[PDB]
Enzyme design. Structure first.
Site, PDB file in Angstrom:
ATOM      1  N   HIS A  32       0.808  -1.211   0.000  1.00 17.71           N
ATOM      2  CA  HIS A  32       0.000   0.000   0.000  1.00 17.71           C
ATOM      3  C   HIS A  32       0.838   1.255   0.000  1.00 17.71           C
ATOM      4  O   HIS A  32       0.373   2.299  -0.461  1.00 17.71           O
ATOM      5  CB  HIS A  32      -0.955   0.017   1.173  1.00 17.71           C
ATOM      6  CG  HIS A  32      -0.297   0.268   2.480  1.00 17.71           C
ATOM      7  ND1 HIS A  32       0.763  -0.476   2.937  1.00 17.71           N
ATOM      8  CD2 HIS A  32      -0.545   1.196   3.425  1.00 17.71           C
ATOM      9  CE1 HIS A  32       1.126  -0.027   4.125  1.00 17.71           C
ATOM     10  NE2 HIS A  32       0.351   0.989   4.440  1.00 17.71           N
ATOM     11  N   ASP A  54      -0.703  -7.956   1.122  1.00 15.46           N
ATOM     12  CA  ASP A  54      -0.282  -6.568   1.016  1.00 15.46           C
ATOM     13  C   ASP A  54       1.205  -6.417   1.284  1.00 15.46           C
ATOM     14  O   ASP A  54       1.631  -5.582   2.079  1.00 15.46           O
ATOM     15  CB  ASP A  54      -1.103  -5.705   1.976  1.00 15.46           C
ATOM     16  CG  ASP A  54      -1.095  -4.235   1.606  1.00 15.46           C
ATOM     17  OD1 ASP A  54      -0.058  -3.736   1.128  1.00 15.46           O
ATOM     18  OD2 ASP A  54      -2.138  -3.573   1.795  1.00 15.46           O
ATOM     19  N   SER A 106       4.300   1.824   8.952  1.00 11.30           N
ATOM     20  CA  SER A 106       4.065   0.578   8.236  1.00 11.30           C
ATOM     21  C   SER A 106       5.378  -0.072   7.826  1.00 11.30           C
ATOM     22  O   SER A 106       6.356   0.606   7.512  1.00 11.30           O
ATOM     23  CB  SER A 106       3.218   0.829   6.999  1.00 11.30           C
ATOM     24  OG  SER A 106       4.042   0.997   5.868  1.00 11.30           O
TER      25      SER A 106
END
Lengths: 155, 49
Positions: A32, A54, A106
């Site tokens: 992402h 992801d 992240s």
């Protein structure tokens, strides 16, 4: 805390928006989040795609294979070290205190006491006085599995 | 001619067999791919947790 070097940031329009982490002679990075990993040798590799987790994953090149983290699926509930502090694992859920982490965190590995990675964080949802992390872990059998508490928002 | 021809008149029961095996093979590969998607999406989406 000292092994956190081997995660390196990605640059998107000049700012850090995430991190790519190297484990098992394989560099990973959340899908992402966009950018280019902030170093040259790992900037080169064509990163293969894994939508269902992801995670873009790639085969780290040769001369720093021995310079990577290890990992296990052995995850007893309890406190586990992580960049910003401790993460408490209980009721098959990783949760950090409220407000710590967010946009840009992240790809941050979550380690155990012995430096072995237990998961990579991809998102979160703030519940009550804690915030539960949507991560990528390995189950008891040890196959990779995305774990998402309901309403996790990507970071 | 004392008769009326129809579209399915000249097919000679081997040509029928050939279009049968062709459509059967085509559908079989497609359906195999579908069942493949089913099993992978079953063991992976569920049944890893």
């Amino acid at each position: 805390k000292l092994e956190s070097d081997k995660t390196f940031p990605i640059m998107l329009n000049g700012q850090v928006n995430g991190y790519a982490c190297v484990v098992g002679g394989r560099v990973f990075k959340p899908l992402h989040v966009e950018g280019r990993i902030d170093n040259e040798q790992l900037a080169a590799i064509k990163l293969k795609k894994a939508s269902i987790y992801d995670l873009e994953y790639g085969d780290v090149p040769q001369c720093m294979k021995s310079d990577t983290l290890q990992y296990t699926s052995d995850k007893p509930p309890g406190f586990y070290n992580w960049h910003h502090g401790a993460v408490q694992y209980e009721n098959n859920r990783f949760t950090v205190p409220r407000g710590v982490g967010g946009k840009g965190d992240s790809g941050r590995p979550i380690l155990d006491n012995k430096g072995r990675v237990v998961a990579i964080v991809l998102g979160g949802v703030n519940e009550g006085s804690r915030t539960a992390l949507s991560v990528v872990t390995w189950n008891q059998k040890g196959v990779t599995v995305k774990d998402t508490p309901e309403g996790s928002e990507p970071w | 001619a004392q008769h009326t021809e129809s579209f399915t008149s000249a097919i000679s029961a081997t040509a029928w067999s050939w279009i049968k095996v062709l459509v059967g093979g085509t559908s079989a590969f497609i359906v195999l791919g579908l069942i493949a998607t089913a099993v992978v999406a079953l063991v992976l989406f569920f049944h890893r947790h």
